[PDB]
Amino acid sequence: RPSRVVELTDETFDSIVMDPEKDVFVLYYVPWSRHSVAAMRLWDDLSMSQSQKRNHLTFVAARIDGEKYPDVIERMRVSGFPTMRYYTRIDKQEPFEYSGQRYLSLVDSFVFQNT
Numbered sequence: 001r002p003s004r005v006v007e008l009t010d011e012t013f014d015s016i017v018m019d020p021e022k023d024v025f026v027l028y029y030v031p032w033s034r035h036s037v038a039a040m041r042l043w044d045d046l047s048m049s050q051s052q053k054r055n056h057l058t059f060v061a062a063r064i065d066g067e068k069y070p071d072v073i074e075r076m077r078v079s080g081f082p083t084m085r086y087y088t089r090i091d092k093q094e095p096f097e098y099s100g101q102r103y104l105s106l107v108d109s110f111v112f113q114n115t
Contacts, residue, residue: 008063024060030067
């Protein structure tokens with residue numbers, strides 16, 4: 001699909017997610033799960049939707065493979081997959097957790113409400 005999602009690693013995670021000029025919505029996934037696959041597609045679509053909205057220069061959709069980077073899953077206190085947390089410009093230490101249904105319109109509305 002079209003995507004502008006950034007694939008993180010343990011080396012690049014803080015530089016992208018904790019950037020104070022960006023509002024960064026992170027998907028933590030494991031690739032062998034169908035639910036995480038679904039969430040990956042949603043994240044591609046979220047990246048494209050946000051690229052056409054007013055916050056396109058500050059919003060970043062990013063993802064990290066928790067099987068490949070269990071260090072990050074431990075450091076960020078993620079306890080299952082998929083997990084979606086929004087690390088806004090000012091709120092890097094108490095990100096907003098998305099627990100709603102996994103459809104683009106609802107995730108776009110959570111972005112707008114929490115930015």
